[PDB]
Short mmCIF file of C-alpha atoms and ligand atoms in Angstrom, two decimals:
data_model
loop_
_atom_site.label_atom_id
_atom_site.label_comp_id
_atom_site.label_asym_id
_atom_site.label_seq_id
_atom_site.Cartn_x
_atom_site.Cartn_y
_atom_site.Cartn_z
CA UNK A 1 -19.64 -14.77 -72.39
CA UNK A 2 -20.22 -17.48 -74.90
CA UNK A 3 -19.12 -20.73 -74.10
CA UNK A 4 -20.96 -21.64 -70.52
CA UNK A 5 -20.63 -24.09 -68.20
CA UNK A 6 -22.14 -24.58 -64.62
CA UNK A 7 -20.63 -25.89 -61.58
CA UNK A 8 -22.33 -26.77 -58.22
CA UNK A 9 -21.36 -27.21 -54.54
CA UNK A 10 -23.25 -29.83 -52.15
CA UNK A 11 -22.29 -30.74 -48.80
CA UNK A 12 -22.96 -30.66 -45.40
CA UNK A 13 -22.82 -26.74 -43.73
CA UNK A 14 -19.53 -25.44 -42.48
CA UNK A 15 -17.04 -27.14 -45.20
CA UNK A 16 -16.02 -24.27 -46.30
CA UNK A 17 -18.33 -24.72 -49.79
CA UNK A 18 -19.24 -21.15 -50.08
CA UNK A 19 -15.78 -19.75 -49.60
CA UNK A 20 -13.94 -22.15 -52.12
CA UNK A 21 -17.19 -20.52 -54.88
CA UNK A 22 -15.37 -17.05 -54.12
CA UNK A 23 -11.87 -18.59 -54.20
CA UNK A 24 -12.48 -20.36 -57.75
CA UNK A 25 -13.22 -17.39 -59.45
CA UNK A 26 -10.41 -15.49 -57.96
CA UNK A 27 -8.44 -18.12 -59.25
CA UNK A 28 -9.70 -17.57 -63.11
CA UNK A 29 -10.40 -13.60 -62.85
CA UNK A 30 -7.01 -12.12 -62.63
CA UNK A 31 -6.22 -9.23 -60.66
CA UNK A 32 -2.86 -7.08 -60.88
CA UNK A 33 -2.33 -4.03 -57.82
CA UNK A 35 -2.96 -4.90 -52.50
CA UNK A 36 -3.07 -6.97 -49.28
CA UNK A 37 -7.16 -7.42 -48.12
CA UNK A 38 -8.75 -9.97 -46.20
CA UNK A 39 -12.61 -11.41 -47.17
CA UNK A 40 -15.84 -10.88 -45.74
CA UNK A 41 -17.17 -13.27 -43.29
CA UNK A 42 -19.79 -15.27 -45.57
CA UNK A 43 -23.20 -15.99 -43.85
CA UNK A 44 -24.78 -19.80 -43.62
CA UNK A 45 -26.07 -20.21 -47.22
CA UNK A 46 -30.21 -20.84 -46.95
CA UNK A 47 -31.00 -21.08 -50.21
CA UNK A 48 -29.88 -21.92 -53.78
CA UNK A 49 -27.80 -19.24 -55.19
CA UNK A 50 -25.90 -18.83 -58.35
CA UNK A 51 -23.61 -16.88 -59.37
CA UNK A 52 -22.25 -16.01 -62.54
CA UNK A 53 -18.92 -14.37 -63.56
CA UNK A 54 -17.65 -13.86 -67.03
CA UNK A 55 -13.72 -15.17 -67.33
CA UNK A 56 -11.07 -15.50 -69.58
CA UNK A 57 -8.50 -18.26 -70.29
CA UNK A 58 -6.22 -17.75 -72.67
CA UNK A 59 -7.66 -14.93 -74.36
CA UNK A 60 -11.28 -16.59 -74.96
CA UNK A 61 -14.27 -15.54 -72.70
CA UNK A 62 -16.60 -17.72 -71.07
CA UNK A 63 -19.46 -17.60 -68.98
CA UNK A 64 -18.97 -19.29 -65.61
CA UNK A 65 -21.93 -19.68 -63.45
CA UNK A 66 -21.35 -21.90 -59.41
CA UNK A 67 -24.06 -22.77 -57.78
CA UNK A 68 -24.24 -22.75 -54.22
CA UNK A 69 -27.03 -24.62 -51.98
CA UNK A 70 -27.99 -24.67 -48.54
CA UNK A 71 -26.23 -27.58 -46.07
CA UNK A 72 -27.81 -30.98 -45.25
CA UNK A 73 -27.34 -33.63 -42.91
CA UNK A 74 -27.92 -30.86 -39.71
CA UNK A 75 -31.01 -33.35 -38.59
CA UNK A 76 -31.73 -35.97 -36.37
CA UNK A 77 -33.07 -37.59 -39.14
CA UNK A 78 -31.99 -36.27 -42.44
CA UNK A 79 -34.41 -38.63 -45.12
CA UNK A 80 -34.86 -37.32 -48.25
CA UNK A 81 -33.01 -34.28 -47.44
CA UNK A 82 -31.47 -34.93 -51.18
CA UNK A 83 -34.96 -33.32 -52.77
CA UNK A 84 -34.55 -29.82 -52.73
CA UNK A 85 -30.63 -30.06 -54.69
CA UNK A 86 -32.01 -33.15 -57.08
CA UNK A 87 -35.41 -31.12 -58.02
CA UNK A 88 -32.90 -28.26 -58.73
CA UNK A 89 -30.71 -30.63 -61.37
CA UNK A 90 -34.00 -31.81 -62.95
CA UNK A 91 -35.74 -28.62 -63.15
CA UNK A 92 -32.72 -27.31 -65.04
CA UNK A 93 -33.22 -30.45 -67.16
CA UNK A 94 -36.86 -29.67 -67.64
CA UNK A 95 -36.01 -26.15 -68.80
CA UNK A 96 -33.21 -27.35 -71.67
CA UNK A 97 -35.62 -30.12 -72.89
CA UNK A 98 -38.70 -27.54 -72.82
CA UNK A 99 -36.86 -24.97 -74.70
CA UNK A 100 -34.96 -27.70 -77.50
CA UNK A 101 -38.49 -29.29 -78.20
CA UNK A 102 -40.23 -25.92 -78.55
CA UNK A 103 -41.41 -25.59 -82.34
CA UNK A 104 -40.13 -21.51 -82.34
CA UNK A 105 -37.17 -22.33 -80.31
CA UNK A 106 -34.20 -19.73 -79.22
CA UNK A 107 -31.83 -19.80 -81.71
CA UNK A 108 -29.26 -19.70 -78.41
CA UNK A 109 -30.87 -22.10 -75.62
CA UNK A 110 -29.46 -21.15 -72.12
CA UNK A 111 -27.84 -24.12 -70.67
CA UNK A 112 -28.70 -23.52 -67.12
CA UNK A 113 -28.02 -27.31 -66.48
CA UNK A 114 -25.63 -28.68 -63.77
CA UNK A 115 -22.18 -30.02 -65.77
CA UNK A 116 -20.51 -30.82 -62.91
CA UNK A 117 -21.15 -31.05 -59.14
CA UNK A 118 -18.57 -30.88 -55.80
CA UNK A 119 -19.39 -32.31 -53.53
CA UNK A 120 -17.39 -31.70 -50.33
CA UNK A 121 -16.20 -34.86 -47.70
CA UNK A 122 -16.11 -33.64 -44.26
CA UNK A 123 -12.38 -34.44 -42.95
CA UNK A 124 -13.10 -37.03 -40.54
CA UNK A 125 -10.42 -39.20 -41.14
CA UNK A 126 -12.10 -42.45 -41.29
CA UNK A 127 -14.56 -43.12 -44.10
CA UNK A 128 -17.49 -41.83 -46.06
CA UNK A 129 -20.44 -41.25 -44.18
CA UNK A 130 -23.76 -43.15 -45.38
CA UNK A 131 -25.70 -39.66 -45.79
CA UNK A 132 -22.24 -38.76 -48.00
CA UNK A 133 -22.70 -41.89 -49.64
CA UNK A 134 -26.55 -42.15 -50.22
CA UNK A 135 -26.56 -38.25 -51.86
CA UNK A 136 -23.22 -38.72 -53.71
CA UNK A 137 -24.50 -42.21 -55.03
CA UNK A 138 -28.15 -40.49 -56.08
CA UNK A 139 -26.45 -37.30 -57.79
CA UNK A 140 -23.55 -39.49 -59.72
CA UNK A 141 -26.97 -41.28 -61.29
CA UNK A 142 -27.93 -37.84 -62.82
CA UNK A 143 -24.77 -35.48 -62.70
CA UNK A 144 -21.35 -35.49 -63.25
CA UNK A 145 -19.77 -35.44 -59.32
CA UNK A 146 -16.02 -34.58 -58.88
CA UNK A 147 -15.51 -35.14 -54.70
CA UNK A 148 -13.96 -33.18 -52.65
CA UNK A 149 -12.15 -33.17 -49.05
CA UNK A 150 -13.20 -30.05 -47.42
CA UNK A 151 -11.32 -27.99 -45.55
CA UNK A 152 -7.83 -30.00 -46.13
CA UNK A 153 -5.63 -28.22 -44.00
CA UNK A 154 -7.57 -30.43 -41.43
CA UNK A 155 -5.95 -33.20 -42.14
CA UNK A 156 -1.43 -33.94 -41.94
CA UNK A 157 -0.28 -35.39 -45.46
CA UNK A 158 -0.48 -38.98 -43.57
CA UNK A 159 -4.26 -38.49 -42.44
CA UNK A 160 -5.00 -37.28 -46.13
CA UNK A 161 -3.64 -39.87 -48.26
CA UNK A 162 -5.24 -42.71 -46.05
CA UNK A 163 -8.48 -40.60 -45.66
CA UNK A 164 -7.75 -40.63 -49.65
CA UNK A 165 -8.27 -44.23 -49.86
CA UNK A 166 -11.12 -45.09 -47.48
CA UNK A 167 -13.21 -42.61 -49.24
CA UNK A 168 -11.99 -43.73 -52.83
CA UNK A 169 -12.95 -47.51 -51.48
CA UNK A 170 -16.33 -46.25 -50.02
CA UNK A 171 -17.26 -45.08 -53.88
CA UNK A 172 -15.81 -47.93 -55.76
CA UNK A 173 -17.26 -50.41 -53.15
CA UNK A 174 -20.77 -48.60 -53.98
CA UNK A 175 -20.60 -48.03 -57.35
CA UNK A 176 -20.53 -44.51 -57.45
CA UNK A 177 -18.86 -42.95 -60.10
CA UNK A 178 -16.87 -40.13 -60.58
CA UNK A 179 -15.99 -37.50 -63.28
CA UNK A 180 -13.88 -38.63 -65.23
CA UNK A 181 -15.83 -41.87 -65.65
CA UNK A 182 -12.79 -44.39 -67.10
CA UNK A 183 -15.24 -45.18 -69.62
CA UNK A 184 -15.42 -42.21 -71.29
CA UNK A 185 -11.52 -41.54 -71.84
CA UNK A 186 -12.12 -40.91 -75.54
CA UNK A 187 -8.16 -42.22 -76.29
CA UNK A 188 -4.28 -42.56 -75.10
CA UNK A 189 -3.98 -38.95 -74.11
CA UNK A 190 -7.48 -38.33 -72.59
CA UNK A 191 -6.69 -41.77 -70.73
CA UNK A 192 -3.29 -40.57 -69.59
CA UNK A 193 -4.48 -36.86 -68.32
CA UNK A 194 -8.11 -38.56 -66.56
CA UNK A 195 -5.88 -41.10 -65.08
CA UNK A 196 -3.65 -38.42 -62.58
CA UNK A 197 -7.14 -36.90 -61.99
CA UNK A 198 -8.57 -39.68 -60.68
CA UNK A 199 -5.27 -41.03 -58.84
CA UNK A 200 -5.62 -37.63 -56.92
CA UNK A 201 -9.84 -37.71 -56.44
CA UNK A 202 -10.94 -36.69 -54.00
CA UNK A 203 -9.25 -33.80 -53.93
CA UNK A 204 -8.02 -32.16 -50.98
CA UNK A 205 -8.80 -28.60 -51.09
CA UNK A 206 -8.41 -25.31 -48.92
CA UNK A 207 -10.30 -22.15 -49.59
CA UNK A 208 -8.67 -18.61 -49.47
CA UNK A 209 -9.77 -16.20 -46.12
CA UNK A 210 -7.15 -13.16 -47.81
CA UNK A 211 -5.21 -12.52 -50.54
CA UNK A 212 -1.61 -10.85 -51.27
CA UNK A 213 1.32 -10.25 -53.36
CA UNK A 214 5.07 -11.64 -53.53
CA UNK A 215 7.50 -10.83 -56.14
CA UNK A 216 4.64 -9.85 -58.62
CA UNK A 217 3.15 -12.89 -58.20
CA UNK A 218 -1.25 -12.95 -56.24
CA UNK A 219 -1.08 -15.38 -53.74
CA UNK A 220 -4.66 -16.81 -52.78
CA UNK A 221 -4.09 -17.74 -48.84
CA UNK A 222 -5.81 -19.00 -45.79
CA UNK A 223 -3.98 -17.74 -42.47
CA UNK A 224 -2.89 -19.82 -39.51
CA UNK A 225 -0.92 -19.46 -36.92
CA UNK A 227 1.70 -20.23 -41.22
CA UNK A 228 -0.11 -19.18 -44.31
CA UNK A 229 -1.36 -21.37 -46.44
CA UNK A 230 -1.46 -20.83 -50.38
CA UNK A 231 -4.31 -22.77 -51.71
CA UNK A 232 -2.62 -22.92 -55.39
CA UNK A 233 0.62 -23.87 -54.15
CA UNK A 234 0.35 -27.78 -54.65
CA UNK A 235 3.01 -28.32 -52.01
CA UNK A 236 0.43 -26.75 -49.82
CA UNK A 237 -2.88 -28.62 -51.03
CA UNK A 238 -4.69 -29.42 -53.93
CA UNK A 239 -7.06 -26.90 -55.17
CA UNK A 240 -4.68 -25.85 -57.78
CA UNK A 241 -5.22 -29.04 -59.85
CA UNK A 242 -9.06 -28.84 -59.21
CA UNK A 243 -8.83 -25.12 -60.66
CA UNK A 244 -6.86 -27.04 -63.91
CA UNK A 245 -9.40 -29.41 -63.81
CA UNK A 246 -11.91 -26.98 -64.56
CA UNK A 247 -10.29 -25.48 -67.67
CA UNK A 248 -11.58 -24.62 -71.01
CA UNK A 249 -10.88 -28.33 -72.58
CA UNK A 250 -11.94 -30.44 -69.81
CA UNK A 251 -15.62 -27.71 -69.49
CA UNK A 252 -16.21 -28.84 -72.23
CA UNK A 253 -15.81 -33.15 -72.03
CA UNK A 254 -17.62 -32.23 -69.00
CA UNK A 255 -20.13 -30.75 -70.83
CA UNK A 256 -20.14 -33.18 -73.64
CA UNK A 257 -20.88 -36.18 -70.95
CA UNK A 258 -23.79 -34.23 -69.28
CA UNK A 259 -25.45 -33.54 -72.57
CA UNK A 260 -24.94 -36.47 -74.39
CA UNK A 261 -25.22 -38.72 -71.07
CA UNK A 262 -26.92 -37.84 -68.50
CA UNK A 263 -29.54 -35.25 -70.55
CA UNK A 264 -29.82 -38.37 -72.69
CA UNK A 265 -30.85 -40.30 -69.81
CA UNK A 266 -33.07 -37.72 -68.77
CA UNK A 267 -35.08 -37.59 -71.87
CA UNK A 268 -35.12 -41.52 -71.90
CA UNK A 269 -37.08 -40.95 -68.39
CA UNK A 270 -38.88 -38.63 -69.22
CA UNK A 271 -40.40 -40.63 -72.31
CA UNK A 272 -41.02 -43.75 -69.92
CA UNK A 273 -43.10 -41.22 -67.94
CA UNK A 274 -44.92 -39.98 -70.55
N1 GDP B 301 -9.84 -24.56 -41.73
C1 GDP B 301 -10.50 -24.14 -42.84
N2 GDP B 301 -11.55 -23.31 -42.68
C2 GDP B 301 -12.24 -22.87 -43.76
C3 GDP B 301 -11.85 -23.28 -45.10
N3 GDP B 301 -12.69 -22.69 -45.97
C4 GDP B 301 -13.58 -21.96 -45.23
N4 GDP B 301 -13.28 -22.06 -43.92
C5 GDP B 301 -14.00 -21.45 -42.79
O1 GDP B 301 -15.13 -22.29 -42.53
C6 GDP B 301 -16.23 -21.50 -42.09
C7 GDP B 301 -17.45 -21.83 -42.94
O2 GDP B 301 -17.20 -21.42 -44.28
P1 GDP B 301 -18.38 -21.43 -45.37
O3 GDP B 301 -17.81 -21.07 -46.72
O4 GDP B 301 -19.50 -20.52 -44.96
O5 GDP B 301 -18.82 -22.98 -45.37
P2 GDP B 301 -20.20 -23.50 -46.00
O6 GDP B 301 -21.30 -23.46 -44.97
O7 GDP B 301 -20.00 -24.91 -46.49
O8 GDP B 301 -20.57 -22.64 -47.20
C8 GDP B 301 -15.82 -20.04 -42.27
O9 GDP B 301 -15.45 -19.51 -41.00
C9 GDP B 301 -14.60 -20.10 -43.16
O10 GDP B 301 -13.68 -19.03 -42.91
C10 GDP B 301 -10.68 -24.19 -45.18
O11 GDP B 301 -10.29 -24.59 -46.29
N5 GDP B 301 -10.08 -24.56 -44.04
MG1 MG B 302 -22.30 -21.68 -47.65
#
């Protein structure tokens, strides 16, 4: 309840973005005690967040996921960006407001986006230029860790070649991903980024139920085998959730504030 960091999910409709919110933090609040399936989530129409307190280690933290309405539903889908990017600047607006302020809070909220994921349909082929234009306009002002949505779409063949059309697509158009190489700080922060961006974007399943075997929660998605979305035989959501773990909040953090806020204040001095 300290210590806060803010996550958000873009994509288009139907990949499964508002399920994987509710599978996240099942994944970081633990639970001990009985076999029960979810609630069918409606179509998300509007920016949401929601905020549970969790504990790693033994250390609380406040984690807050945004969820957002799909795009990309149109015939033609211009500007369709707006609503999400006037969301990551407002937040902006608000931190720079309240750290300029001459009676400031002695604790500003940092309502600002650290980090957003942004979910890849699984087509199979390659990045779609809607995927491409909003990914390459929110990587300009946010840290973006990508996604494949709903993974169990795809064999282990179609997802490692999906892997690297999509990986192409945003080194071929200059979009960057967290973690930027540039920012490995040294030899171990270079060694850790570097599996985490050998397995971006990740391929990730959200949970539908959840049980227990031999003591142990299972988070799973049923088909007609179950799959357990932190088994990483299964898929990879289990190295997103380590991903997003006290030490790696917090370079997250560290690259929002002291880049892209940085940036923001830059702009916002060539504005006026
Ligand atoms: N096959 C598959 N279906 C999923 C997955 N995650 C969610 N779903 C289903 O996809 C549908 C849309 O889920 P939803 O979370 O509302 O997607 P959203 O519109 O992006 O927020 C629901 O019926 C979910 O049960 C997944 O990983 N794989
Ligand atoms: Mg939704």
């Amino acid at each position: 309840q300290g210590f806060e960091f803010n996550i958000m999910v873009v994509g288009q409709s139907g990949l499964g973005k508002s399920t994987l919110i509710n599978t996240l933090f099942k994944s970081k609040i633990s639970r001990k005690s009985q076999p029960t399936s979810e609630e069918r989530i409606p179509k998300t129409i509007e920016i949401k967040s929601i905020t549970h307190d969790i504990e790693e280690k033994g250390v609380r933290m406040k984690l807050t996921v945004i969820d957002t309405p799909g795009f990309g539903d149109h015939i033609n889908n211009e500007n369709c960006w707006q609503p999400i990017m006037k969301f990551i600047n407002d937040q902006y607006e608000k931190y720079l407001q309240e750290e300029v302020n001459i009676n400031r809070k002695k604790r500003i909220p940092d309502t600002r986006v650290h980090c957003c994921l942004y979910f890849i349909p699984a087509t199979g082929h390659s990045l779609r230029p809607l995927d491409i234009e909003f990914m390459k306009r929110l990587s300009k002002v946010v840290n973006i860790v990508p996604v494949i949505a709903k993974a169990d779409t795809l064999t282990l063949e179609e997802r490692v070649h999906f892997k690297q059309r999509i990986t192409a697509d945003l080194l071929s158009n200059g979009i960057d991903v967290y973690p930027q190489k540039e920012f490995d700080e040294d030899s171990e922060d270079r060694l850790v980024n570097e599996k985490f961006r050998e397995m971006i974007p990740f391929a990730v399943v959200g949970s539908d139920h959840e049980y227990q075997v031999n003591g142990k929660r299972i988070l799973g998605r049923k088909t007609k085998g179950t799959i357990e979305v932190e088994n990483t035989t299964h898929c990879e959501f289990a190295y997103l959730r380590d991903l997003l773990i006290r030490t790696h909040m917090q370079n997250i953090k560290d690259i929002t504030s002291s880049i892209h806020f940085e940036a923001y204040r830059v702009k916002r001095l060539n504005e006026g």
